[PDB]
Amino acid sequence: LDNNVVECIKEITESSRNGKLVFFVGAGVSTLSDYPQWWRLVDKYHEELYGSPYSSDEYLRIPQIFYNVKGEMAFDGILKDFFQVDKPTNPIHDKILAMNPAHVITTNYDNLIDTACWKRGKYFSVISAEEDVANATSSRYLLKVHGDFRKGFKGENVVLKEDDYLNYDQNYPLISNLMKTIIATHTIVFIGYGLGDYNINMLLNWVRKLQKDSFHKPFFIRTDPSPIENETLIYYENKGLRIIDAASLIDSNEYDYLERYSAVMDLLIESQENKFITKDDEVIDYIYGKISPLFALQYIRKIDLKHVFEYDYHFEVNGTVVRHKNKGFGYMERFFELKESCDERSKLSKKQYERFNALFNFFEKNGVICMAKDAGTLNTSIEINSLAYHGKYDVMKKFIEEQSVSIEDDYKKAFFLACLGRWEESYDLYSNIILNSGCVYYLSQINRYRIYQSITQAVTQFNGLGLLTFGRHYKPFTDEFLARIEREMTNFNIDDLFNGMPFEFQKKYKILEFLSDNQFLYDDTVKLFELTNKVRSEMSEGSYSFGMSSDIVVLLRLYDNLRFLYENCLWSVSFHEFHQYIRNSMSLLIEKAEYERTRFFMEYYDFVNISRHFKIDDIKNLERS
Amino acid sequence: YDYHFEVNGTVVRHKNKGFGYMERFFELKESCDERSKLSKKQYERFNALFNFFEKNGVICMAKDAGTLNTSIEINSLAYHGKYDVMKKFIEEQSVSIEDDYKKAFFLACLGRWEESYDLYSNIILNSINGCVYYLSQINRYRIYQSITQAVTQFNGLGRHYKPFTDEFLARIEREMTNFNIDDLFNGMPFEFQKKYKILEFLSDNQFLYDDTVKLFELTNKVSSDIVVLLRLYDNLRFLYENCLWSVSFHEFHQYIRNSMSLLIEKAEYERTRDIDELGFGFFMEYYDFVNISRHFKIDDIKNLERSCSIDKIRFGEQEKIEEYLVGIAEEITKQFSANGMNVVFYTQFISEAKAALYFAKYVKLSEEGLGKIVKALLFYFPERDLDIGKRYVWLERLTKCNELPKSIISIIDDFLVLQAEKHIDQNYSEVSSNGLYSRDYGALIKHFEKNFISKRLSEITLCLTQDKQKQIDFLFKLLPLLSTNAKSHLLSFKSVENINDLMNGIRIGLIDEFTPEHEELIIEYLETRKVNYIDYMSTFGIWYFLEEINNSKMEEFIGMDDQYDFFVDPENFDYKKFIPSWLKNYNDKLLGKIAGNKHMKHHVIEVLKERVKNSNDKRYLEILMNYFI
Amino acid sequence: THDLVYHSKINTFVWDVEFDIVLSDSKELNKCYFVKCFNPYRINGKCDFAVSSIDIFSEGKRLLIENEFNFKITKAVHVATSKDVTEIVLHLSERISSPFPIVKEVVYLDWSHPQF
Ligand SMILES: NC(=O)c1ccc[n+]([C@@H]2O[C@H](COP(=O)([O-])OP(=O)(O)OC[C@H]3O[C@@H](n4cnc5c(N)ncnc54)[C@H](O)[C@@H]3O)[C@@H](O)[C@H]2O)c1
């Protein structure tokens, strides 16, 4: 399609994914379900008032004249007999619901949208009157700005006559304010409205008064039989509307409106999961959008990368990518093809080339190599660039003494203090980092909660068993500091920390969420158990596999976890569960190594891991077996 | 977090700064005199609270903790596999929407996933506290995922089946298009999100990461076991009593597998450590048996068996376990004896039935229940899951704790007769994965009934002619079960003119005693081989060793085949030519005879010692330890 | 040879390779493999000595060995990769010094036995 239409589709789909898509459904969608159009009611009123059978002003005048003359009772009776008819819900109502709109504002008096929401299993708090605004039982509103007949098929429950429109701002202050707020704070798509519609032009007049760039242009799904004249499109797009023309979208008849609506609805829905990348520039742009936030982190676990790309690709611990659920374009395959072919790289733009270079550095440093099919002799050295890991106590002390040149240096200083036993100073530094700081801010919140937990456990042990173990009552933390930390952290909920973040952060740093609990140890843990079983099974039956060791995955995952936790300066490295995981992985590795030897060699990293994560009893058990 | 509730039914205050309402409630519950003060409404509210706390197994605080009876009791038809009762429940008219939610769960458990999904949609329509609405949305999404995975599996995989009509599949795909399970809770009324926060985890892809990661405490070596077991029971009860479909997903099955396996391994480690220190643990019950059967594959059960000495695991509530096994047998018969095979239900149920009948080796089975289980396994178990050899393995495992009764022997004879009758066709052949065939069933029958004679097989042999050679050679492997006249009738149908015929007869069991003409046949073969010198040789060497030949002239063929010389004259054999791998081929009888020869036993002892010291081979080590060869 | 496994309980190999062999009677069998079953607990008759039983499957169906099965391997074809693994097969057969050094699959019947 046209570039602007594709841009509108991309914006609409992004809003739908972010939960910031509001649908302004007009009378056209309702009429799509054969619901009686208003002109039928106006013609009936005209036929009753005069001999027999309308302009935009007549739309409001004829109902008003009929009211004033024939009585509210007569007006109400006509409305009731004309509108008290059940109608089905269109496939377009279901398409609108499937777009996952945050809110659905509508000028329709019918329950067709209500019925579609009820059927589709969507809970919307229906706001059709003034009292409904305060009584909204949910945070997602189905806002009938012009009322409806839920209370009754009375003419005072809906906005039909001219007087109703004249006094709308005075009779529906709460509802009007809610509609304007939803428009301001959401992405609005108009469907079922004529461009010359009364409500649309009133909304445009309201938008005229706003700041020049203080609002997002609403999207207008125009589904009239003929294509919009360029003059009309110029006039209405300069008024704050981005128009998606259905007539220009497809070829259609003059009175097949359902097809025209469905064209746009389906084109939007099917683009929900479409990356919308065909050229290499767009693919690299998408990959950079996915990977750039991770540049803050020192190292990213490969098994975590699957969440970065929404399970599109498996990222194996050996550095090979595999297609998992990416039914669309293969962008990782394209990226690796660009990486291999240097000539292609120049074909990218300047900014695209720079982004590709940054992505190449990120992937190379994180050990992501290529796809499974292209995998060769994949061997990688396990190096952890951490002072805490290598036990550089003097070096960490010197670094702590130095001045903080950045907030990242403050983070590393706090981690080193936690690793040197200076938990009070580390907690104070973490609080200072929180105040000064949002990846570092979130990680500092997590690390401060972890250090508070460690302080609480240490105090518990010292007061309960510290005196017996040391033969003395040790008070490493002053009662003042303990009380202050209890006051500060008593109101802190780690579980809700991630949610209490800007939605963009929760979209760009989803992988960090697992650091809140031991869920980050789940996958690896499960794998370990499985692998353990398998390995043991082999040793039980005496089989001797030739080639890739079955435990190399365990070792790779172990070092992945160690790098992620230590290079990123996360206090989780001191967790009991993490120590048990490391101990079990190393015990399996050593048992398998012995079994193979009878028929792996201990290195510096293996020695350090065994010393740090193994108790003496575990080492004795290893020596026994 | 004002209080922390132990998995054993006791509360402990923590993170609570205000009044101790839990302690006050427990004190009020203990004494009715203090209860009498409460207002009428407060009295009824306290009664409801007491009912809830007793039902949920919360007893008292940590200080009041005493003789705590933590007995698991999962009140669910789906857990106990009461499939007939579930079908009856679904058939009956549902009075309320709670019964509809139960019906949808039961339909999911029975493989009727389309009906379950439609019922969930109906409940969603008619349910808008909103707890049933939220749970129905969760379960409908789960069932949609299950349907999608089943469709993928059936597309990938023995016969092409289409349990879900493409119209229904398209309808559900459209209905669930762009459906977000993450936003389900956040879209609920704030009153619901406040009252029912504890249900949040049901919308998450993973909810057992905490429970799984807490399993590392079972791998320590320095009660954790009871904590893990009670946590597993809590999860099972919550997922089944509340009728949540996530109880059937791979995550929960894996969690149960890991927890049970690590618990058993920890018990075994404790047992061995206690044996090492004191120098001479996991008591399984009905729920443990059901969990192992349902959530364990056969490979997982085999891993448990090889890792630990499950024979040392005493099994309790054996009558309940036998009821479970008999119910599984009845369901197998219904699924296959009749034409009611549900593809979707069968896919899930066959694994549980297989694991249950495999694990039944450790349970004492009553004679009538044993007969029902045996018949169901032998006859109505589909061959695409248990082939002839696997079925024999399953059956023979049942004799470990139940000596083959006469009724089970009759059932096995019925199976043998049917197998023989199936051989009238010249194209039907037994297909086995374990290498075990009907002759193995006959051998087992003779093992537990040495003098048992099969009348119907005897008759089948007495009707055989030279035409249907398939039945002939089939009944040859069943010779011991045949009668004297039937044996004579069968024997006439084979010739032993040449040595190869003798080998075939010995392998099939036609001849068990070597007549002098047989020895002369072996001798002429030896002479021809010796002349042509410038496979059976080891066989004849073993036969002479095994005292199967008293010819006493075989010694003329010593000096060309190492095994033959080693077996004929162990004293004169040069053991620098001995290959230790030979000991890896002999069965228990031959190895024991070699050990007891009183000659060459020291040579084999030294070769085995060298092997154990140089390779640490468990096979050689166990050969040396068992027979001390 | 990455899928090759050495089963030491019965000193044989598990490898996904079919065999074309010529027996001592010039008979030709194509796409034939062997399946070993380690059964020490098997109910043994008077003349049974071997611990493991081997079945031969040609073209997906087993064969009844009514004659002396003295055979020589003429070709070995790997399923995962069509590469001929013959020479390696002869090397392993020479090294093993056991009947049927390479087997399509080994079935361990000791752990599933009641007496285990
Ligand atoms: N006095 C009248 O206005 C009057 C009276 C009777 C019939 N009609 C004719 O019948 C139709 C009534 O529609 P309108 O003039 O109020 O449209 P309209 O231009 O007033 O409404 C415009 C919006 O409604 C939608 N829409 C228009 N006609 C539709 C239909 N038949 N079904 C579903 N959606 C529809 C379009 O998508 C468009 O975005 C028009 O074609 C009109 O010419 C008009």
Coordinates of N, CA and C in Angstrom, one line a residue, chain B residues 30-136:
Chain B
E30 N -9.9 -21.8 70.1 CA -9.6 -22.8 71.2 C -10.7 -22.8 72.3
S31 N -11.1 -21.6 72.7 CA -12.1 -21.5 73.8 C -13.4 -20.9 73.3
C32 N -14.5 -21.6 73.5 CA -15.8 -21.2 73.1 C -16.3 -20.1 74.1
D33 N -15.8 -20.0 75.3 CA -16.2 -19.0 76.2 C -15.9 -17.6 75.7
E34 N -14.6 -17.4 75.2 CA -14.3 -16.2 74.5 C -15.1 -15.9 73.3
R35 N -15.5 -17.0 72.6 CA -16.3 -16.9 71.4 C -17.7 -16.4 71.7
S36 N -18.2 -16.7 72.8 CA -19.6 -16.3 73.1 C -19.8 -14.8 73.1
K37 N -18.7 -14.1 73.4 CA -18.8 -12.6 73.4 C -19.2 -12.0 72.1
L38 N -18.7 -12.6 71.0 CA -18.9 -12.0 69.7 C -20.3 -11.8 69.3
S39 N -20.6 -10.7 68.6 CA -22.0 -10.5 68.1 C -22.5 -11.6 67.2
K40 N -23.8 -11.6 67.0 CA -24.4 -12.6 66.2 C -23.7 -12.7 64.8
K41 N -23.7 -11.6 64.1 CA -23.0 -11.5 62.8 C -21.6 -11.9 62.9
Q42 N -20.9 -11.4 63.9 CA -19.5 -11.8 64.1 C -19.3 -13.3 64.5
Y43 N -20.3 -13.9 65.2 CA -20.3 -15.3 65.5 C -20.4 -16.1 64.3
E44 N -21.3 -15.8 63.4 CA -21.5 -16.5 62.1 C -20.2 -16.3 61.3
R45 N -19.7 -15.1 61.2 CA -18.4 -14.9 60.5 C -17.3 -15.7 61.0
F46 N -17.2 -15.8 62.3 CA -16.1 -16.6 62.9 C -16.4 -18.1 62.6
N47 N -17.6 -18.6 62.6 CA -17.9 -19.9 62.2 C -17.5 -20.2 60.8
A48 N -17.8 -19.3 59.9 CA -17.4 -19.5 58.5 C -15.8 -19.5 58.4
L49 N -15.2 -18.6 59.1 CA -13.7 -18.5 59.0 C -13.1 -19.8 59.6
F50 N -13.7 -20.4 60.6 CA -13.2 -21.6 61.2 C -13.4 -22.8 60.2
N51 N -14.5 -22.8 59.5 CA -14.8 -23.8 58.5 C -13.7 -23.7 57.4
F52 N -13.4 -22.5 57.0 CA -12.4 -22.3 55.9 C -11.1 -22.7 56.4
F53 N -10.7 -22.4 57.6 CA -9.3 -22.7 58.0 C -9.2 -24.2 58.3
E54 N -10.2 -24.8 58.8 CA -10.1 -26.3 59.0 C -10.0 -27.0 57.7
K55 N -10.9 -26.5 56.7 CA -10.9 -27.2 55.4 C -9.5 -27.0 54.7
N56 N -8.9 -25.8 54.8 CA -7.6 -25.5 54.2 C -6.4 -26.1 55.0
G57 N -6.7 -26.7 56.2 CA -5.6 -27.3 57.0 C -4.7 -26.3 57.6
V58 N -5.3 -25.3 58.2 CA -4.5 -24.4 59.1 C -5.0 -24.6 60.5
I59 N -4.0 -25.1 61.4 CA -4.4 -25.6 62.7 C -4.2 -24.5 63.8
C60 N -3.0 -24.1 63.9 CA -2.7 -23.2 65.0 C -1.4 -22.4 64.7
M61 N -0.9 -21.7 65.7 CA 0.4 -21.0 65.5 C 1.5 -21.9 65.7
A62 N 2.8 -21.4 65.5 CA 3.9 -22.2 65.7 C 4.1 -22.7 67.2
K63 N 3.8 -21.8 68.1 CA 3.9 -22.2 69.5 C 2.9 -23.3 69.9
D64 N 1.7 -23.3 69.4 CA 0.7 -24.3 69.7 C 0.9 -25.6 69.0
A65 N 1.9 -25.6 68.1 CA 2.1 -26.8 67.2 C 2.4 -28.0 68.1
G66 N 1.7 -29.1 67.8 CA 1.8 -30.4 68.5 C 1.8 -31.6 67.6
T67 N 1.0 -32.6 67.8 CA 0.9 -33.8 67.0 C 0.1 -33.4 65.8
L68 N 0.8 -33.0 64.7 CA 0.2 -32.5 63.5 C 0.1 -33.7 62.5
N69 N -1.1 -34.0 62.2 CA -1.4 -35.1 61.2 C -1.6 -34.4 59.9
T70 N -0.6 -34.5 59.0 CA -0.6 -33.9 57.7 C -0.9 -35.0 56.7
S71 N -2.2 -35.4 56.5 CA -2.6 -36.4 55.6 C -3.2 -35.7 54.4
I72 N -2.6 -36.1 53.2 CA -3.1 -35.5 51.9 C -4.5 -36.1 51.6
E73 N -5.4 -35.3 51.1 CA -6.7 -35.7 50.6 C -7.1 -34.8 49.5
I74 N -7.0 -35.2 48.3 CA -7.3 -34.4 47.1 C -8.7 -34.8 46.7
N75 N -9.7 -34.0 47.0 CA -11.1 -34.3 46.7 C -11.4 -33.8 45.2
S76 N -11.1 -34.8 44.3 CA -11.3 -34.5 42.9 C -11.5 -35.8 42.2
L77 N -12.6 -35.9 41.3 CA -12.8 -37.0 40.5 C -11.7 -37.2 39.4
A78 N -11.2 -36.0 38.9 CA -10.2 -36.1 37.9 C -8.8 -36.7 38.4
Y79 N -8.5 -36.4 39.7 CA -7.3 -36.9 40.2 C -7.3 -38.4 40.3
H80 N -8.4 -39.0 40.8 CA -8.5 -40.4 41.0 C -8.9 -41.2 39.7
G81 N -9.0 -40.5 38.6 CA -9.3 -41.2 37.3 C -10.7 -41.8 37.4
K82 N -11.7 -41.2 38.0 CA -13.0 -41.7 38.0 C -13.8 -41.3 36.8
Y83 N -13.3 -41.9 35.6 CA -13.8 -41.4 34.3 C -15.2 -41.7 34.1
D84 N -15.7 -42.8 34.6 CA -17.2 -43.1 34.5 C -18.0 -42.1 35.3
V85 N -17.5 -41.7 36.5 CA -18.2 -40.8 37.3 C -18.1 -39.4 36.6
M86 N -17.0 -39.0 36.0 CA -16.9 -37.8 35.3 C -17.9 -37.7 34.2
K87 N -18.0 -38.8 33.4 CA -18.9 -38.8 32.3 C -20.4 -38.7 32.8
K88 N -20.7 -39.3 33.9 CA -22.0 -39.2 34.5 C -22.3 -37.8 34.9
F89 N -21.3 -37.1 35.6 CA -21.4 -35.8 36.0 C -21.7 -34.8 34.8
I90 N -20.9 -35.0 33.7 CA -21.1 -34.2 32.5 C -22.5 -34.4 31.9
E91 N -23.0 -35.7 31.9 CA -24.3 -36.0 31.3 C -25.4 -35.3 32.1
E92 N -25.3 -35.3 33.4 CA -26.4 -34.7 34.2 C -26.4 -33.2 34.0
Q93 N -27.6 -32.6 34.2 CA -27.8 -31.2 34.0 C -27.1 -30.4 35.1
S94 N -26.4 -29.4 34.8 CA -25.7 -28.6 35.7 C -26.6 -27.5 36.3
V95 N -26.7 -27.6 37.7 CA -27.6 -26.7 38.4 C -27.1 -25.2 38.3
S96 N -25.8 -25.0 38.6 CA -25.2 -23.7 38.7 C -24.1 -23.6 37.7
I97 N -23.4 -22.4 37.8 CA -22.2 -22.2 37.0 C -21.0 -22.8 37.5
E98 N -20.9 -23.0 38.9 CA -19.8 -23.8 39.4 C -19.8 -25.2 38.9
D99 N -20.9 -25.9 38.8 CA -21.0 -27.2 38.2 C -20.6 -27.1 36.8
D100 N -20.9 -26.0 36.1 CA -20.4 -25.9 34.7 C -18.9 -25.8 34.6
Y101 N -18.3 -25.1 35.5 CA -16.9 -25.0 35.6 C -16.2 -26.4 35.8
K102 N -16.8 -27.1 36.8 CA -16.4 -28.5 37.0 C -16.6 -29.3 35.8
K103 N -17.7 -29.2 35.1 CA -18.0 -29.9 33.9 C -16.9 -29.6 32.8
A104 N -16.6 -28.4 32.6 CA -15.6 -28.0 31.6 C -14.2 -28.6 32.0
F105 N -13.8 -28.6 33.3 CA -12.6 -29.3 33.6 C -12.7 -30.8 33.4
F106 N -13.8 -31.4 33.7 CA -13.9 -32.8 33.5 C -13.9 -33.2 32.0
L107 N -14.5 -32.4 31.1 CA -14.5 -32.5 29.7 C -13.0 -32.4 29.2
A108 N -12.3 -31.4 29.7 CA -10.9 -31.4 29.4 C -10.1 -32.6 29.8
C109 N -10.4 -33.1 31.0 CA -9.7 -34.3 31.4 C -10.1 -35.6 30.6
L110 N -11.2 -35.6 30.0 CA -11.7 -36.7 29.2 C -11.3 -36.7 27.7
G111 N -10.6 -35.7 27.3 CA -10.2 -35.5 26.0 C -11.2 -34.8 25.1
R112 N -12.4 -34.5 25.6 CA -13.4 -33.8 24.9 C -13.1 -32.3 25.0
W113 N -12.1 -31.9 24.2 CA -11.6 -30.5 24.4 C -12.5 -29.5 23.7
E114 N -13.2 -29.9 22.6 CA -14.1 -28.9 21.9 C -15.3 -28.6 22.8
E115 N -15.9 -29.7 23.4 CA -17.0 -29.4 24.3 C -16.5 -28.6 25.5
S116 N -15.3 -28.9 26.1 CA -14.8 -28.2 27.2 C -14.6 -26.7 26.8
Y117 N -14.1 -26.4 25.7 CA -13.9 -25.0 25.2 C -15.2 -24.3 25.1
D118 N -16.2 -25.0 24.5 CA -17.5 -24.4 24.3 C -18.2 -24.1 25.7
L119 N -18.0 -25.0 26.6 CA -18.6 -24.8 27.9 C -17.9 -23.7 28.7
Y120 N -16.6 -23.6 28.5 CA -15.9 -22.4 29.1 C -16.3 -21.1 28.5
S121 N -16.6 -21.1 27.2 CA -17.1 -19.9 26.6 C -18.5 -19.5 27.1
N122 N -19.3 -20.6 27.3 CA -20.7 -20.3 27.9 C -20.6 -19.8 29.3
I123 N -19.7 -20.4 30.1 CA -19.5 -19.9 31.5 C -19.0 -18.5 31.5
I124 N -18.1 -18.1 30.6 CA -17.6 -16.7 30.5 C -18.8 -15.8 30.1
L125 N -19.6 -16.2 29.2 CA -20.8 -15.4 28.8 C -21.7 -15.2 30.0
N126 N -22.0 -16.3 30.8 CA -23.0 -16.3 31.8 C -22.4 -15.9 33.2
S127 N -21.1 -15.7 33.3 CA -20.5 -15.4 34.6 C -20.2 -13.9 34.8
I128 N -20.5 -13.1 33.8 CA -20.3 -11.6 34.0 C -21.6 -10.9 34.2
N129 N -18.7 -12.0 41.9 CA -17.3 -11.8 42.3 C -16.4 -11.9 41.2
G130 N -16.8 -12.6 40.1 CA -15.9 -12.7 38.9 C -14.8 -13.7 39.0
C131 N -14.7 -14.5 40.1 CA -13.7 -15.5 40.2 C -13.9 -16.6 39.2
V132 N -15.1 -17.1 39.1 CA -15.4 -18.1 38.1 C -15.1 -17.6 36.7
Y133 N -15.5 -16.3 36.4 CA -15.2 -15.8 35.1 C -13.7 -15.8 34.8
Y134 N -12.9 -15.3 35.7 CA -11.4 -15.2 35.5 C -10.9 -16.6 35.3
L135 N -11.3 -17.6 36.2 CA -10.8 -18.9 36.1 C -11.2 -19.6 34.8
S136 N -12.4 -19.3 34.3 CA -12.9 -19.8 33.1 C -12.1 -19.3 31.9

